[PDB]
Amino acid sequence: VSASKTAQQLKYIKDSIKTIPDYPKAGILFRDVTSLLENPKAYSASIELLSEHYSESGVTKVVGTEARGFLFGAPVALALGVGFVPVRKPGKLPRETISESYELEYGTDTLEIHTDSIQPGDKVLVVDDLLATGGTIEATVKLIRRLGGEVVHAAFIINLPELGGEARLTQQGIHCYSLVSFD
Amino acid sequence: VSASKTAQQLKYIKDSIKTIPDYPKAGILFRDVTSLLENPKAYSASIELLSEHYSESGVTKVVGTEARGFLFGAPVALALGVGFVPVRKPGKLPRETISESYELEYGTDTLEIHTDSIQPGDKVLVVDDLLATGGTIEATVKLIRRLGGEVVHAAFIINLPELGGEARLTQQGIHCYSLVSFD
């Protein structure tokens, strides 16, 4: 596709995301991916661009974190013809799990994954809506690699590179692909 | 499709869901839809059967509740070519919302929806993974109807009719379609 037509599609996706001022607090801008979800053309385009980007990568599994990550991961898995494996806050997955901690602003939290859902060999794509500090993604990577899965790719709708996520993931050997970014 | 072949596909979907004994507590059986998600054939079939069921219904919007509902709702929206509108626990949606309470075992909780995402005219399908007591779905319906959307359909992967969900939704004029059910 011509750079003209690719730019028009990427712009249509970016213009579909709303910017909310002073949310969650004063002096913070919040990029709301829900306006993208309600526009079938923008939502379907975002899934196409993500899935196509990895169509030759030999991905065997897609992992997305709860909750907004499920919105992009699971359609990407469907588009690639591969299973989808959720990573969840603790006590939600019923079968045997492993766990990893991560930092929040005011405390720590954990993510879990089903131990039976990743096995040695698997080539795992991580998908999430937004890359900010990268802490949940760094935890997820650890989870996947502990179960013997290989992960070198993470994909997002939005990157906020100033929050350091992309730079942190790079340190773990993760290449990040984001449809759009903001300052 | 022949009743033979339809039964084989529906069986393949049902056999993909695992039954976990004594979860979340003793003497309760938990039906785990994550084993279905990791099987691309079963996951893709479940989306096809849900989307096809409504292909003539004039649906203009799909609503799913956080979090496992996003797993089925959002691919159904994509398959139908319509927007997806999340219903979330409180303080997660950034734009103007309305709210509805529902009962849990030990307390009350609320769900929210973006007021701008449903407008008069809209014909709304609700999708969720599992129909149990139906309290979250009954709240969601109220939300949609308050914004002027019409909702007469809710779709699920799993129905547990003994917990009363299906019977409660019926009282609100909701027809429920579930791929599988358990006792």
Ligand code: NA
């Ligand atoms: Na494993």
Ligand code: NA
């Ligand atoms: Na409205």
